[PDB]
Write a protein that binds this ligand. Structure first.
Ligand SMILES: N[C@@H](Cc1c[nH]c[nH+]1)C(=O)O
Ligand SMILES: N[C@@H](Cc1c[nH]c[nH+]1)C(=O)O
Ligand SMILES: OCc1ccccc1Br
Ligand SMILES: OCc1ccccc1Br
Lengths: 414, 414
């Protein structure tokens, strides 16, 4: 026998599991539509060069890469944002801004080795309204799935606070991305180790202390005390919360000075969704990244913000909260030939049902009526349509509702 | 200076314009599957190479995009979906209720294009030709849904059992039958001398090659009946098939062609392929019955199966030629325009309201003047512009303009 299990770290989606994935993806799509985002896609295979950012990111470290027959360095995408940037760079001035682009790529790593990730990005918007919209969209999706502000929230911060603190200590700006990557590890590794890694990057103890203290500040007012009310981060975070409040999602968002995210490229506001019971990893994660397109060679800087929202953590949360009931397969009609001599007539009926916009099966194999009826019930049919010779002479069929029996004229079926 | 903006060799980018076209096609695939009662499934694009080692000289297996993992395992990006389907079915065993009708739209790979999407539809557990009938009707249904007629396209249908008998009657070992089909499939693409030469290499003497050639040239089912008998399975099955399609109302879409064998090793019975009636393009779709495949994978019980693949590239060319792919512009229902920044919070409340009612709506995110906001609304194909101005807001109103503006109460917007 062949190996029936999928390749290591990869998931099969038979119909039962696919209904769940589809339930989630319907919401991603519907939220994107609601918010005016346009769908896009790019190949799962990208040039390895696209991901060589040299900032010690977990995402780039764990790349599923390989060498082609022909010698080119390629990888299965670990994330979508670089692909997005490539596409935008390729369009150049022909791209109308602002642009709001979304996709649901499968992404890879070399435990799980694959996941689907809803991406939403806003391009060409300088102001925090982008971050506001992005954060509102994530919440909207979660609410659409049945979660409340009691179940989840979005922690929000700005990397600019830490940028100032780092820059005020004389630390070269090129070290800032590494600092964020390192400091992101606070939750997952001991503070001694995070401190040790910053030393290796070349930062003296008093600078590491200032970094640590600022991650512990518990309000925007406390940020304002340390760096000034006029500091960009304060201004931007205030606007952000004001706008979310106005949109009516105030209960869903909050400030957290320890949120930096682990990606090199975030320059401004960053955020991540979390379950308020502290049971799961981040539900989604994002931020502003205004320099990325410059680093790729854009002659003009291009503001961007966005987020990724994985398919795995959300499903665990929903299961825990009992918000993923099994969704059984449904079809409107199952057409049942009384016997094989009635199959041609049954096919005409089937045709008619489908032409009217109904989902319909015909029993394909040779079955007795009661077995056909059982099958109809298994596939979750709303209605069984028996095509029998006596009724057919009347220009009729027998109909029976499943969610005992009625003759109906052919023309009145739909 | 700049990252490579082109995608990896042989792979396509789908920016929003191109994605709308793919999505238009995929909507039809999905809708046809739903109409026909098929259930969605999916499996990893990465599969064990062992899954595709069929040793029949198939083009599909020859052109595999395969590579070796760091851990030394032979894997491949799937060249087709049918082996994955079989794996999943084998994995479910007796827990799978039959009949089953499963569909998917996988991206499949090969090493000038290296990548395509392919709608798969398969019926499992149905011994009789009604499966093939349904499959063929579904392909036609999809094509008709896209605007094609029986004047534009058709499905050529045959049975491999005719050739099976002819080959078996000449004393040719049954294990050589799959190779014969693979070779004979090449008739349309390469000279008859070469096809004859390849069969000789497989070990068949000239008179056997003649019998093969003659049977591929038979022009009707009656002529098949003369050669192998009216009671031969193929004749019986093909007659039932055409009778059923006729009854379903798709008789003008289908026809007999004795030269159709397909290039896959595993087809045992009826085979078919869609074609444009102008003779301009390669096959639009292709499929057949494959009743032994699950036995070769190690199923203790034989499991009847039939299905088809329907690629995303040929159909698009046909539709373009026929002027059935008008540019589908991006649409959104509402664009909300703050009169100025002081009106943004109120605008956000309006935006929230619009979206809560099931409408797709943007808000202008950056600072711009009203007429420029109006232009932008028109670019994104907005049905309606909603101006949020201080005077109207005091009235509990906004100004609406369809794409002379007029005032509307907030509650009457939706
Ligand atoms: N690529 C980020 C999410 C994101 C999308 N856009 C901007 N950021 C991640 O994987 O975490
Ligand atoms: N896998 C076949 C199509 C098919 C699906 N099911 C049965 N046949 C192909 O790639 O041509
Ligand atoms: O964090 C999970 C994950 C991230 C990136 C690629 C693949 C996976 Br699975
Ligand atoms: O016939 C085109 C094709 C077949 C299989 C995989 C990838 C492609 Br492109």
């Amino acid at each position: 026998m062949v190996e029936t299990e999928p390749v290591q770290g990869c998931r099969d989606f038979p119909p039962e599991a696919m209904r769940c994935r589809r339930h989630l993806f319907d919401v991603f799509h519907a939220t994107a539509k609601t918010f005016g985002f346009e769908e896009y896609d790019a190949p799962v295979l990208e040039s390895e060069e696209l991901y060589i950012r040299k900032a010690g990111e977990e995402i780039t470290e764990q790349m599923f890469n390989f060498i082609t027959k022909g010698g080119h360095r390629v990888a299965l995408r670990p994330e979508m944002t670089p692909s997005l940037a490539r596409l935008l760079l390729g369009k150049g001035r022909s791209l109308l801004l602002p642009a709001k682009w979304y996709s649901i790529p499968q992404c890879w790593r070399y435990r799980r080795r694959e996941h689907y990730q809803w991406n939403m990005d806003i391009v060409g918007v300088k102001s925090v309204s982008a971050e506001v919209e992005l954060v509102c969209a994530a919440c909207w999706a979660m609410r659409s799935l049945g979660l409340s502000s009691k179940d989840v929230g979005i922690k929000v911060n700005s990397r600019k606070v830490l940028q100032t603190v780092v820059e005020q200590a004389g630390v070269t700006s090129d070290k800032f991305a590494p600092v964020c990557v390192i400091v992101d590890k606070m939750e997952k590794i001991p503070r001694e180790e995070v401190e040790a890694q910053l030393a290796v990057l070349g930062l003296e103890p008093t600078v590491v202390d200032a970094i640590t203290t600022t991650l512990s500040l518990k309000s925007i007012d406390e940020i304002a005390q340390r760096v000034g009310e006029e500091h960009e981060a304060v201004k931007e975070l205030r606007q952000f919360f004001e706008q979310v409040e106005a949109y009516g999602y105030g209960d869903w968002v909050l400030f957290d000075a320890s949120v930096v995210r682990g990606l090199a490229y975030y320059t401004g506001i960053v955020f991540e969704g979390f379950d308020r019971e502290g049971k799961f990893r981040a539900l989604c994660g994002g931020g502003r990244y205004d320099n990325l397109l410059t680093t790729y060679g854009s002659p003009t800087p291009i503001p961007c913000a966005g987020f990724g929202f994985g398919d795995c953590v959300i499903v665990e949360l929903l299961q825990e909260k009992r918000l993923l009931p099994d969704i059984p397969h449904v079809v409107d009609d199952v057409v049942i030939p009384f016997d094989e001599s009635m199959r041609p007539h049954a096919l005409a009926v089937l045709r008619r049902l489908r032409d009217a916009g109904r989902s319909a099966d015909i029993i394909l194999d040779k079955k007795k009526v009661v077995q056909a009826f059982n099958y109809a019930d298994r596939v979750g049919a709303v209605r069984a349509v028996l095509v029998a010779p006596e009724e057919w002479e009347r220009g009729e069929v027998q109909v029976k509702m499943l969610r005992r029996g009625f003759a109906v004229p052919l023309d009145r079926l739909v």
